[PDB]
C-alpha cells in the first residue's frame, strides 16, 4: 500500500522538506540514507514512503516541481536534502509570475509531460498503489495552476485510486498576494470536480498556535511546517504501524464524505501545550479529547460554533484503553448535542494505533467535516465579485488567453457549493 | 470467464505516457458536473468491464 | 455532572425526556420511558455507577 | 553553468540541530531554521554544481 | 480510592518488564523451540 | 505579566521547566516512553523498561 | 406487584408503590410493539442526491 | 468428534488468538506444537482431536483458518509467539480492506479471495472422519466481516449442505459505536445470517464492558478481556465433546432442544462465576447460587433485558463439582420464580449437561479460579427489541440517502436496502407472533 | 433548558439587560466614530446597526432540530393499532 508524494511550488517544497525530515526521523533513516533504526517495527513498513536502494540505503518516493529552481536549491542545500533522487527535480527557465493562467496554460503545458513521465515511472513500480498525496498553496501561481493541471491528468489516468490534497488558503485578515481571489476560485472549481478529499490550513491559525498556545519567543517557518508535517504524518500512521483498530485513507473517506461534493475538511492536532505548563497537567484520554475539540488547536480561522458537524474522525496514537475512547466520544456527543447533525446517529469514527511519535506518550489527530467552511467560500466569492465587476486585474488573465466564461463558471460552481452546505446545515426530517 | 481483478490489468496507456500538452486549450475549459466519472462519485465503473460480480 | 438526575433542575438538552427514539419513531412500545431513562449514559452516573446502562 | 569549472558545492553548518544532540524533534524546537544559526545566507545553485 | 490499607512493597519485588505476569513466568510451559525450522536453524 | 498582540505573556524567569528530577542515567530519545516499540497483543500490560 | 416495575424506575409516592401503566387502558406489556411503520421505497423518478450540483 | 473454526476480519482473528491460547493451555500443547505422550501403544487419549491433528513429526496443528483482507493483523499473528503453531497456508491475507462497505466485500473484493478460503476448508474437511459443524467468528459492523462472511456462508451452505454452521457474532452496540456506516452493514448482514445459520449467538461490547466493570474490578478494560470471556464460553460449550461427564450433550442436542421453529435461532448467552479474587474469599459458590446468577441480566453478554420477553428454551451446562440432585433442586427453584416466565406452549423448559473438567486458568487472566461453573444459552422473544434499535438508525440515515452513493457506485442496487429492511420487519413480526400466549376460536 | 419560574425570570431579565447593553454600546461606538452628536448621523448609525451580524443559534423552533416525539404522538393519536396490521400482530 504505497503513497506517491508530489510537492509543487514554494510552499509545497518548503513544507515537503520538513515532512521528509519528520518521516526520516520516525523510521530512523540517516541523512546519508542508511537505515540506522532500533526496532523491526520501523523497518517492516518502510516501503510505504520509501523506495529501496541496494546496500543500506532507502530513497523517498517524491516528485518536486517548480518553475524556477530557487526553492529546490534551498531544500537541496539543507541538511537532509541529499536523500532526494536527482532525476526527481523538474524545473523550467522562467517564473510563474504569480499568475494562475501562466502556470496552467503557458509554462504548464511546456513542463507537464516531464512531470507526468516521472509520476508514471513512480506509480507503475508499486506492487499495489494507494492514493497520491499533493502539497501546494491555492493562492500562488505554479502551485495552483500546475497542481490542479496535474491532478486532472492523474484523475484521467488513475480514476480508481484515491486523490488527496493538502492546501494552503488565504487568511481572512491579511493577504500575501493581491490576486488571491482569482487563483483561489479557479483552483476550488478544479478541485471540487476532480478531488476526493481536500484539507485546508490558514497561516494565521499557525501563527496563533505558535504565539498563544506554545508561547514561542521567536517562531520560524520551520515550526509552522513542522505542525503541518506532524498532522500529515499522523493521518497515515495506521497505514504503517500495528494497532487495535486499523484504519485507511479509503475508510476515512467512506466515513467522512456523505455526498461527493462535500469533501473539504478541517484539521487539528491536540497535545499542543507549552513546556512550562506541562508539569501542571498529565497526559490522559480526557485531556486529549478536551484539547482535540478546543478551537485553539484547530488550523483554520473559522470557528465550529457557527456551524454543525456532519462527521468527524479521530486517530489516536499510543497504548491506551478502548473503554476511555468510547465513553469520551459518547459523552462529548451527548453533552454538546445541538452542534451534531441529528439525522446521523453517530458522527465520530475512532481509530487506535500502538506507536506514538517519539517523546510523547500519546497523540491524536482530528479531521472534521464542518459547515463553517462555507464562510470562507462566501468571503472568497464576495472578493471575486468585487474584483470582477470592475475588471480590476483581469487583463493579465485575458491576455494569456482565458475566456471570461471560465470565471463565471467557477463563480457559479463555488456559489452552488456554498448553497449546498447551507441547505444541509439547516435540513430537517419533517 | 472473467478478468483477474476489479482493478484493470488491461489499460491502453501505462508507463509509456500520453501526449498531454496537446490536450490543453484555453477555449475548451472545464464545465460544471463534467469531471471524471469515478466509483467514489456513485457511477458503477465495474459494470463497464467483463469482471463477473458475485450473484 | 451538569444535567444529573439527582436534582430537581432539568439541565439536559431540549426535549431530552421526549426525544425521537426507537420506541417512539416507527415503533410503539409500552416501555418507552424505561429505555429513554436507561440510554442517558453521562447523566445516570450515580444511579448506574460508572456503567453505560 | 558557464563560470569557472573549479567551483564546487559549498559547505554549510546549520548548528543547533536537535537530532544531532541526542534530543527528540519536539514541537517548537526547530532551531536549525533560525537565521542566527546559519553561517551564511548566500544562495548557491547547488542543482548545477 | 484510599491507599491506607494497601500492603507495602518489598525491595526485592520486580516491577519492571521482566516481572510481568505472562506466559514467560509460567515455568510449566517451555518456550524453547524443539521441532520446526527455528529449532533446526538453532546453533 | 504583560499583554502583547492581544495575548498574555510571562517572563521566562517565572515560566520554565523544573530543574529537579535528575535520575542520573543516560537514555536515548527512543527510551523516554516505556513500551515505545511494543504492541498490545505482544504485551497487554504496562511496565517500566527492563534494565 | 408480583412482576415488579420490570426494571423501570418510578417516581416515589407518599402512599404505596407505583406501577407502570400501558397506553390508554391497555395492560402493561413491555416487549410487544403496537404500531410498526415501514417507510415506502423511493419512487423511480426521484432525483438522486449525488447526481448533480445545486439545490 | 471434531470442529473447524473459521475466523474472519479483525474481531474474529483477535478473538481467535484468545481461543487458541486457551485451548492450547487447557490441553497442554506447547507453543511450538509439541506434546509428550505415552510410549506404549493403546495407553493414550484423544481429547485434543476435536481441535488438533498431529503431524508425523509429532507437531500439533489446529483446525482453523484465519481470513482477512488487510495484512497487518495476520502478519501480527505470523510474527507473534504462536508462529510455529499454525500452518502458514491457514493464515490467508489479501491486499486491501473492504473499507466498511458490505458491497465492496460481497461483490468486488471478497469475490477474489473466497475461492482460496473454500479450497482450504475443503482440505480440512477431507482430513476428518466425524465432522459435526462449523464455528464462525465475525463482526457484522465492518465491511469485510459482513460482506465476505455472508458470501462465504452462502458458498459453504451450497457446498456442504446439511452440516451445521454456528456463529458467534459481534453485533453493533445500541449506543457505543465505532463507525458511521454500521447500520447499513448490519442490516445487509442479517439477511444472510437469517438464511444461512443454524444457531446464532449475539454479543455486544457494551455489555461485556459493563460486566467487566461491575463483576470484575477493572478500571480500564480492553478487547483482550472481552476475547478471553468469549473463549471461556466457547470452551464451556465444547467441553461436553472433550471430557468425561455424567450427562453429555452432542451439538445436535443443542439444536434439537433450543430451536422450536427453523427461523427462531437467535440465542442469548451468559456465564455465572465471573468474580474477582477478593470476592472469592467472601462468597460461597454453591450450585443454586450460580444458577441464580445466570438469570441476572447483569450476567448477560448481550445488551437486552429478558424480563421484556418470554423464554422458549434454556440449555444449562454445568462443569465441575455438581451433583444431578442439586441441579434438579436449583431448576425447580428457578421454575418457582414469577419473574422468570416461559411461553405456555413450552412446559418442560430446560436442558442440562454435566461435565467433570473444571474451567482452566490463563496466566494473565482476570477471572478467579473456581471449582465449578455453569453456562447457559437460551432462546427468548426479547431479542426482537435488539433489532429495532439498529432498524431505527437505518431509517434515520436512509431518509436522506446519506451515504448510499458509495454502495451504488461499488456495485449494489438501491433496492437491496428496502428488501433487507422489510426482511427485518418480518423477522420482528415472527418473534412477536411466536411469543403470543394461547389463541382463540375466532 | 429548565422550566422553573426562577429560570424563566432570570432569562427575561437577561434578555432585557442584553438589549439595553447592545443599544448603549452601539451608540457609544457611533459617537466615537463620528466625534459628533448631531441628528444627521442617525441614518448611517441605523444602517450600521442593521449591518451588524449576530451569532447563530440551533435551538430555535423554526428549523426545529429537537422534536418532542411523545407529545407529537399524543397529539396525532397514535395510541395503538387495533386489529393488527401487515407488520403488527393483533393484541
Ligand atoms: N469484542 C471485540 N470487538 C471488536 C474487536 N475488534 C473489533 N471489534 C469491533 O467490531 C467492529 C469493527 O469491525 P472490524 O472487525 O474492525 O471490521 P473488519 O472485519 O476489519 O472490516 P474492514 O474494516 O472492512 O476490514 C467495531 O464495533 C469494533 O468495536 C475485538 O477484538 N473484540
Ligand atoms: N505555511 C507556509 N506557507 C507558505 C510557505 N511559503 C509560502 N507560503 C504561503 O503561500 C502563499 C504564497 O504561495 P507561493 O508558494 O509563493 O505560490 P508560488 O509562487 O506558485 O510558489 C502565501 O500565502 C504564503 O504565505 C511556507 O513555507 N509555509
Ligand atoms: Mg479491518
Ligand atoms: Zn430550575
Ligand atoms: Zn457631525
Among I55, I56, I63, whose Cβ lies nearest the Cβ of A428? I63
G4 vs C: CB within 8 A: no
Sign of CA dihedral F4, F8, F14, F16: negative
Cα separation, H172 vs H390, in Å, equals 8
DSSP letter (8 states) at residue H270: E
DSSP letter (8 states) at residue E6: P
Contacts of H429 in chain I (CB under 8 A): 87-89
Experimental resolution (Å): 2.8
Q: Per 3-state DSSP, what percentage of chain F is helix, strand, and coil (rounded to 5)?
A: 5, 15, 80
Q: Strand A264-269 vs strand A197-202: parallel, antiparallel, or unpaired?
A: parallel
DSSP letter (8 states) at residue H368: P
Cα separation, H390 vs H421, in Å, equals 10
Which of H143, H336, H348, H322 is CA-nearest to residue H260? Answer: H348
Helices H143-160 and H182-195 pack at an angle, to 10 degrees, of 10
Cα separation, F28 vs G15, in Å, equals 72
CB H340 within 8 Å of CB H297: no
Residues with Cβ within 8 Å of residue B1, at least 6 apart in sequence: B50, B52
Question: Which grid coordinates are listed for H232?
Answer: 471461556
State which of A12, A74, A99, A140 you would mutate to test the pocket of ligand 2, scoring each by most atoms of that ligand within 8 A of its C-beta.
Answer: A140
Among C8, C9, C24, whose Cβ lies nearest the Cβ of I69? C24
What does the angle CA F2 – CA F4 – CA F6 come to, to the nearest 5 degrees? 110
Question: Can you give I12-73 as a three-state secondary structure string?
Answer: HHHHHHHHHHHHHHHHHHHHHHHCCCCHHHHHHHHHHHHHCCCCCCCCCCCCCCCCCHHHHH
Contacts of G52 in chain B (CB under 8 A): 33
List the single residue in F with minimal CA-CA distance to H17. Answer: F41
Cα separation, H236 vs H357, in Å, equals 10
C-alpha dihedral over A133, A135, A140, A142, to 10 degrees? Answer: -60
Cα separation, D3 vs D9, in Å, equals 13
Cα separation, H305 vs H44, in Å, equals 47
Cα separation, A50 vs I9, in Å, equals 66
Q: Strand A163-169 vs strand A264-269: parallel, antiparallel, or unpaired?
A: unpaired
Cα separation, A180 vs G19, in Å, equals 69
DSSP letter (8 states) at residue A219: -
State which of H11, H110, H149 you would mutate to test the pocket of ligand 1, scoring each by most atoms of that ligand within 8 A of its C-beta.
Answer: H11
Atom of ligand 2 nearest to the CA of A98: 19
Cα separation, A24 vs A42, in Å, equals 10
| H or E element at residue H150 | helix H143-160
C-alpha C37 – ligand 4 centre gap (Å): 20
Sign of CA dihedral H136, H141, H144, H149: positive
Which of E17, A39, H81 is CA-nearest to residue F46? Answer: E17
C-alpha dihedral over I73, I75, I76, I80, to 10 degrees? Answer: 50
Question: Which grid coordinates are listed for I87?
Answer: 407488520
Strand, coil or helix: what is H3? Answer: strand
Sign of CA dihedral A119, A120, A122, A128: positive
Output the DSSP codes for H49-109.
GGTEEE-TTS-EEESEEEEESSSHHHHHHHHSS-TTTS-GGGEEE-SS--TT-HHIIIIII
DSSP letter (8 states) at residue A305: G
CB A120 within 8 Å of CB A153: no
Strand, coil or helix: what is A233? Answer: helix
CB H222 within 8 Å of CB F40: yes
**In whole angstroms, how far apart are CA I88 and each of C27, H14, I83?**
10, 40, 9
> How large is the C-alpha radius of gyration of chain C?
12
Strand, coil or helix: what is A27? Answer: coil
Query: Long-range contacts for A286-293 (Cβ within 8 Å, ≥24 apart)?
Result: A286/A324, A286/A328, A288/A316, A288/A362, A288/A363, A288/A364, A289/A328, A289/A329, A289/A332, A289/A364, A292/A268, A292/A364, A292/A366, A293/A332, A293/A366
Strand, coil or helix: what is A207? Answer: helix
Among C27, C29, C37, whose Cβ lies nearest the Cβ of G30? C29
CB H80 within 8 Å of CB A40: no
CB A365 within 8 Å of CB A291: no
CB H300 within 8 Å of CB H271: no
Question: Which grid coordinates are listed for I68?
Answer: 418532542
Question: Which grid coordinates are listed for A1?
Answer: 500500500
How deeply is H348 buried, as exposed, middle or buried, from its count of CB atoms within 10 A (0-12, 13-18, 19+)?
A: exposed
Cα separation, H52 vs H70, in Å, equals 27
Output the DSSP codes for A262-287.
--EEEEEE-----TTTTTTS---HHH
How deeply is H378 buried, as exposed, middle or buried, from its count of CB atoms within 10 A (0-12, 13-18, 19+)?
A: buried
Atom of ligand 1 nearest to the CA of A244: 6
Phi, psi of A71 (to 5 degrees): -65, -45
Question: Which grid coordinates are listed for H259?
Answer: 430451536
* Bridge partner list, A65: A8, A90
Atom of ligand 2 nearest to the CA of A8: 21
* Bridge partner list, H135: H5, H166
Task: Give the position of cell 502478519.
Answer: H75
Cα separation, B40 vs A328, in Å, equals 31
Please work out whether the CB of residue H141 comes within 6 Å of at least one atom of ligand 1.
Answer: yes
Helices H384-398 and H415-434 pack at an angle, to 10 degrees, of 150
What is the CB neighbour count within 10 angstroms for residue I71?
A: 11
Question: Which grid coordinates are listed for A30?
Answer: 540517516
Q: Strand H311-320 vs strand H372-380: parallel, antiparallel, or unpaired?
A: antiparallel
Cα separation, H80 vs H240, in Å, equals 31
CB H204 within 8 Å of CB H303: yes
Strand, coil or helix: what is H364? Answer: coil
Among D9, D24, D30, whose Cβ lies nearest the Cβ of A226? D30
Phi, psi of A92 (to 5 degrees): -100, -150
* Bridge partner list, H366: none
C-alpha H10 – ligand 3 centre gap (Å): 5
Catalytic residue set of H: 253
Cα separation, G51 vs H1, in Å, equals 56
* Helical segments of chain G, H only: none
Residues with Cβ within 8 Å of residue A220, at least 6 apart in sequence: D30, D33, D34
Cα separation, A168 vs F42, in Å, equals 41
Cα separation, A69 vs A91, in Å, equals 6
CB A342 within 8 Å of CB H399: no
CB A322 within 8 Å of CB A244: yes
Method used to solve the structure? cryo-EM
Buried b / exposed e along A63-85 (16+ C-beta atoms within 10 A): bbbbbebebbbbbbbbebbebbb
CB H372 within 8 Å of CB H364: no
CB H35 within 8 Å of CB H49: no
State which of A15, A168, A220 you would mutate to test the pocket of ligand 2, scoring each by most atoms of that ligand within 8 A of its C-beta.
Answer: A168
DSSP letter (8 states) at residue C27: -
Q: Measured between CA atoms, how close is H307 to chain G, in angstroms?
A: 6
Buried b / exposed e along H379-407 (16+ C-beta atoms within 10 A): bbbbbbbbbbbbbbbbbbbbebbbbbbbb
**In whole angstroms, how far apart are CA H88 and each of E36, E37, H15, H62, I27?**
13, 13, 19, 12, 81
Task: Find the residues whose C-beta lies inside 6 A of ligand 2.
Answer: A 9-11, 14-15, 96, 98, 137, 139-143, 168, 176, 203, 221, 224-225
C-alpha dihedral over H275, H277, H278, H281, to 10 degrees? Answer: 90
Residues with Cβ within 8 Å of residue I4, at least 6 apart in sequence: C8, C9
List the single residue in G with minimal CA-CA distance to C33. Answer: G8
Residues with Cβ within 8 Å of residue H353, at least 6 apart in sequence: H240, H245, H247, H248, H249, H315, H316, H317, H318
| H or E element at residue F3 | strand F2-4
Beta strand residue intervals within H321-417, DSSP E: 350-355, 372-380
Output the DSSP codes for B9-39.
S--S-STT----GGG--TTS---TT-S---G
Task: Say yes or no for a CB contact (<8 Å) between D24 and F32.
Answer: yes
Contacts of B39 in chain H (CB under 8 A): 409-410
Phi, psi of H323 (to 5 degrees): -110, 135
Q: Per 3-state DSSP, what percentage of chain C is helix, strand, and coil (rounded to 5)?
A: 20, 0, 80
Residues with Cβ within 8 Å of residue A261, at least 6 apart in sequence: A192, A417, A420, G53
**In whole angstroms, how far apart are CA F43 and each of A173, E21, F35, G32, H257?**
51, 10, 9, 47, 42
Which of A274, A275, A237 is CA-nearest to residue A355? Answer: A237
Question: Which grid coordinates are listed for H112?
Answer: 477474489
C-alpha dihedral over H425, H431, H432, H438, to 10 degrees? Answer: 150
Cα separation, H32 vs E30, in Å, equals 9
CB A39 within 8 Å of CB A67: no
Q: What is the largest CA-CA distance in chain C?
A: 32
**In whole angstroms, how far apart are CA H91 and each of H10, H86, H95, H356?**
13, 8, 13, 34
Which of A348, B6, A130 is CA-nearest to residue H104? Answer: B6
CB A168 within 8 Å of CB A138: yes
Question: Which grid coordinates are listed for A270?
Answer: 491536540
Question: Which residues keep their CB under 5 angstroms from ion ligand 3?
Answer: H 10
Amino acid at each position: 500500500r504505497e503513497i506517491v508524494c508530489v510537492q509543487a511550488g514554494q510552499c509545497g517544497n518548503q513544507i515537503g522538506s520538513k515532512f521528509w525530515e519528520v518521516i526520516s526521523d520516525e523510521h530512523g533513516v540517516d541523512p546519508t540514507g542508511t537505515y540506522q533504526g532500533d526496532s523491526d517495527l520501523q523497518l517492516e513498513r518502510i516501503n510505504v514512503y520509501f523506495d529501496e536502494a541496494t546496500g543500506g540505503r532507502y530513497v523517498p518516493r517524491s516528485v518536486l516541481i517548480d518553475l524556477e529552481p530557487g526553492t529546490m536549491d534551498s531544500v537541496r542545500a539543507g541538511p537532509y536534502g541529499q536523500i532526494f533522487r536527482p532525476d526527481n527535480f523538474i524545473f523550467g527557465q522562467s517564473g510563474a509570475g504569480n499568475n494562475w493562467a501562466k502556470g496552467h496554460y503557458t509554462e504548464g503545458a511546456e513542463l507537464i509531460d516531464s512531470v507526468l513521465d516521472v509520476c508514471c515511472k513512480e506509480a507503475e513500480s508499486c506492487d499495489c498503489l494507494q492514493g497520491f498525496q499533493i502539497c501546494h498553496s491555492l493562492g500562488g501561481g505554479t502551485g495552483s495552476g500546475m497542481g490542479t493541471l496535474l491532478i486532472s491528468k492523474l484523475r484521467e489516468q488513475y480514476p480508481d485510486r484515491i486523490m488527496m490534497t493538502f492546501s494552503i488558503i488565504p487568511s481572512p485578515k491579511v493577504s500575501d498576494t493581491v490576486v488571491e481571489p482569482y487563483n483561489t476560485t479557479l483552483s476550488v472549481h478544479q478541485l471540487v470536480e476532480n478531488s476526493d478529499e481536500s484539507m485546508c490550513i490558514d497561516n494565521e491559525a499557525l501563527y496563533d498556535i505558535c504565539f498563544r498556545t506554545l508561547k514561542l519567543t521567536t517562531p520560524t517557518f520551520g515550526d509552522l511546517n513542522h505542525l503541518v508535517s506532524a498532522v500529515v504524518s499522523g493521518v497515515t500512521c495506521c497505514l504503517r504501524f500495528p494497532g487495535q483498530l486499523n484504519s485507511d485513507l479509503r475508510k476515512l473517506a467512506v466515513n467522512l464524505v456523505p455526498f461527493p461534493r462535500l469533501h473539504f475538511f478541517m484539521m487539528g492536532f491536540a497535545p499542543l501545550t507549552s513546556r512550562g505548563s506541562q508539569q501542571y497537567r498529565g497526559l490522559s484520554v480526557p485531556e486529549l479529547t478536551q484539547q482535540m475539540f478546543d478551537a485553539k488547536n484547530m488550523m483554520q480561522a473559522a470557528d465550529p460554533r457557527h456551524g454543525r458537524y456532519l462527521t468527524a474522525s479521530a486517530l489516536f496514537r499510543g497504548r491506551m484503553s478502548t473503554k476511555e475512547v468510547d465513553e469520551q466520544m459518547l459523552n462529548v456527543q451527548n453533552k454538546n448535542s445541538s452542534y451534531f447533525i441529528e439525522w446521523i446517529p453517530n458522527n465520530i469514527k475512532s481509530s487506535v494505533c500502538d506507536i506514538p511519535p517519539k517523546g510523547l506518550k500519546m497523540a491524536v489527530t482530528f479531521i472534521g467535516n464542518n459547515t463553517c467552511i462555507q464562510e470562507m467560500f462566501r468571503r472568497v466569492g464576495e472578493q471575486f465579485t468585487l474584483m470582477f465587476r470592475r475588471k480590476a486585474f483581469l487583463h493579465w488573465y485575458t491576455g494569456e488567453g482565458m475566456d471570461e466564461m471560465e470565471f463565471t463558471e467557477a463563480e457559479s460552481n463555488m456559489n452552488d457549493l456554498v448553497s449546498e452546505y447551507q441547505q444541509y446545515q439547516d435540513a430537517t426530517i419533517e | 470467464n472473467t478478468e483477474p481483478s476489479v482493478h484493470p490489468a488491461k489499460k491502453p496507456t501505462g508507463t509509456f505516457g500520453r501526449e498531454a500538452s496537446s490536450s490543453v486549450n484555453p477555449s475548451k475549459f472545464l464545465k460544471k458536473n463534467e469531471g471524471v466519472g469515478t466509483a467514489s462519485r456513485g457511477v458503477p465503473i465495474v459494470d463497464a468491464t467483463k469482471f463477473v460480480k458475485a450473484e | 455532572t451538569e444535567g444529573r438526575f439527582e436534582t430537581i433542575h432539568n439541565l439536559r438538552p431540549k426535549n431530552w425526556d421526549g426525544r425521537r427514539h426507537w420506541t417512539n419513531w416507527h415503533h410503539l412500545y409500552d416501555c418507552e420511558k424505561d429505555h429513554l431513562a436507561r440510554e442517558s449514559c453521562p447523566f445516570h452516573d450515580l444511579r448506574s455507577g460508572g456503567q453505560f446502562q | 553553468m558557464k563560470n569557472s569549472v573549479a567551483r564546487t558545492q559549498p559547505v554549510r553548518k546549520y548548528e543547533n540541530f536537535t537530532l544531532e544532540n541526542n534530543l527528540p524533534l519536539a514541537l517548537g524546537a526547530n532551531f536549525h531554521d533560525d537565521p542566527i544559526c546559519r553561517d551564511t545566507n548566500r544562495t548557491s545553485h547547488t542543482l548545477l554544481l | 480510592g484510599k491507599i491506607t490499607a494497601e500492603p507495602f512493597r518489598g525491595p526485592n519485588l520486580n516491577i519492571t518488564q521482566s516481572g510481568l505476569p505472562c506466559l514467560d513466568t509460567f515455568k510449566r510451559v517451555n518456550m524453547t523451540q524443539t521441532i520446526g525450522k527455528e529449532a533446526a536453524l538453532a546453533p | 505579566f504583560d499583554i502583547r498582540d492581544g495575548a498574555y505573556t510571562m517572563h521566562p524567569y517565572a515560566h520554565h521547566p523544573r530543574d529537579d528530577t535528575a535520575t542520573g542515567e543516560n537514555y536515548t530519545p527512543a527510551q523516554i516512553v516505556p513500551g515505545q516499540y511494543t504492541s498490545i497483543a505482544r504485551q497487554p500490560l504496562h511496565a517500566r523498561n527492563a534494565i | 406487584h408480583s412482576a415488579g416495575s420490570h426494571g423501570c424506575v418510578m417516581y416515589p409516592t407518599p402512599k404505596g408503590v407505583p406501577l407502570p401503566m400501558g397506553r390508554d387502558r391497555a395492560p402493561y406489556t413491555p416487549g410487544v410493539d403496537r404500531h410498526r411503520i415501514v417507510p415506502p421505497p423511493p419512487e423511480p423518478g426521484a432525483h438522486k442526491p449525488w447526481q448533480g450540483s445545486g439545490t | 468428534r471434531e470442529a473447524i473454526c473459521i475466523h474472519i476480519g479483525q474481531a474474529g482473528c483477535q478473538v481467535g488468538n484468545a481461543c487458541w491460547e486457551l485451548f492450547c493451555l487447557e490441553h497442554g500443547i506447547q507453543p511450538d506444537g509439541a506434546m509428550p505422550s505415552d510410549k506404549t501403544i493403546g495407553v493414550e487419549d484423544d481429547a485434543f482431536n476435536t481441535f488438533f491433528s498431529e503431524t508425523g513429526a509429532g507437531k500439533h496443528v489446529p483446525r482453523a483458518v484465519f481470513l482477512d483482507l488487510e495484512p497487518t493483523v495476520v502478519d501480527e499473528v505470523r510474527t507473534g509467539t504462536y508462529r510455529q503453531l499454525f500452518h502458514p497456508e491457514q493464515l490467508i491475507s489479501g491486499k486491501e480492506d473492504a473499507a466498511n462497505n458490505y458491497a465492496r466485500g460481497h461483490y468486488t473484493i471478497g469475490k477474489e479471495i473466497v475461492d482460496l478460503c473454500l479450497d482450504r476448508i475443503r482440505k480440512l474437511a477431507d482430513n476428518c472422519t466425524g465432522l459435526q459443524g462449523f464455528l464462525v467468528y465475525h463482526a457484522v459492523g465492518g465491511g469485510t466481516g459482513s460482506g465476505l462472511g455472508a458470501l462465504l456462508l452462502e458458498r459453504l451452505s451450497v457446498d456442504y449442505g446439511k452440516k451445521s454452521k454456528l456463529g458467534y457474532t459481534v453485533y453493533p452496540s445500541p449506543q457505543v459505536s465505532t463507525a458511521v456506516v454500521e447500520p447499513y452493514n448490519s442490516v445487509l448482514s442479517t439477511h444472510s445470517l437469517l438464511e444461512h445459520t443454524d444457531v446464532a449467538a449475539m454479543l455486544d461490547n457494551e455489555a461485556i464492558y459493563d460486566l467487566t466493570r461491575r463483576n470484575l474490578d477493572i478500571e480500564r478494560p480492553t478487547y483482550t478481556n472481552l476475547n478471553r470471556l468469549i473463549g471461556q464460553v466457547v470452551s464451556s460449550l465444547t467441553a461436553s465433546l472433550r471430557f468425561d461427564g455424567a450427562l453429555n450433550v452432542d451439538l445436535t442436542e443443542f439444536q434439537t432442544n433450543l430451536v422450536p421453529y427453523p427461523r427462531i435461532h437467535f440465542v442469548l448467552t451468559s456465564y455465572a462465576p465471573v468474580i474477582s479474587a477478593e470476592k472469592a474469599y467472601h462468597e460461597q459458590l454453591s450450585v443454586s447460587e450460580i444458577s441464580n446468577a445466570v438469570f441476572e441480566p447483569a450476567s448477560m453478554m448481550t445488551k437486552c433485558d429478558p424480563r421484556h420477553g418470554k423464554y422458549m428454551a434454556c440449555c444449562l451446562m454445568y462443569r465441575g463439582d455438581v451433583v444431578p440432585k442439586d441441579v434438579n433442586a436449583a431448576v425447580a427453584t428457578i421454575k418457582t420464580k414469577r419473574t422468570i416466565q416461559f411461553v405456555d406452549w413450552s412446559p418442560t423448559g430446560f436442558k442440562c449437561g454435566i461435565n467433570y473438567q473444571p474451567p482452566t486458568v490463563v496466566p494473565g487472566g482476570d477471572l478467579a479460579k473456581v471449582q465449578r461453573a455453569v453456562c447457559m444459552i437460551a432462546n427468548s422473544t426479547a431479542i426482537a427489541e435488539v433489532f429495532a434499535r439498529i432498524d431505527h438508525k437505518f431509517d434515520l440515515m436512509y431518509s436522506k440517502r446519506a451515504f448510499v452513493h458509495w454502495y451504488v457506485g461499488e456495485g449494489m442496487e438501491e433496492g437491496e436496502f428496502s428488501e433487507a429492511r422489510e426482511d427485518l420487519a418480518a423477522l420482528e413480526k415472527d418473534y412477536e407472533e411466536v411469543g403470543a400466549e394461547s389463541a382463540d376460536m375466532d | 433548558h429548565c422550566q422553573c419560574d426562577f429560570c424563566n425570570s432570570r432569562r427575561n431579565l437577561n434578555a432585557k439587560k442584553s438589549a439595553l447593553m447592545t443599544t448603549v454600546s452601539h451608540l457609544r461606538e457611533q459617537q466615537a466614530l463620528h466625534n459628533c452628536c448631531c441628528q444627521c448621523h442617525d441614518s448611517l448609525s441605523q444602517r450600521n446597526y442593521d449591518r451588524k451580524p449576530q451569532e447563530p443559534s440551533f435551538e430555535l423552533d423554526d428549523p426545529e432540530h429537537h422534536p418532542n416525539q411523545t407529545e407529537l404522538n399524543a397529539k396525532m393519536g397514535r395510541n395503538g393499532l387495533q386489529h393488527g396490521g401487515e407488520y403488527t400482530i393483533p393484541p
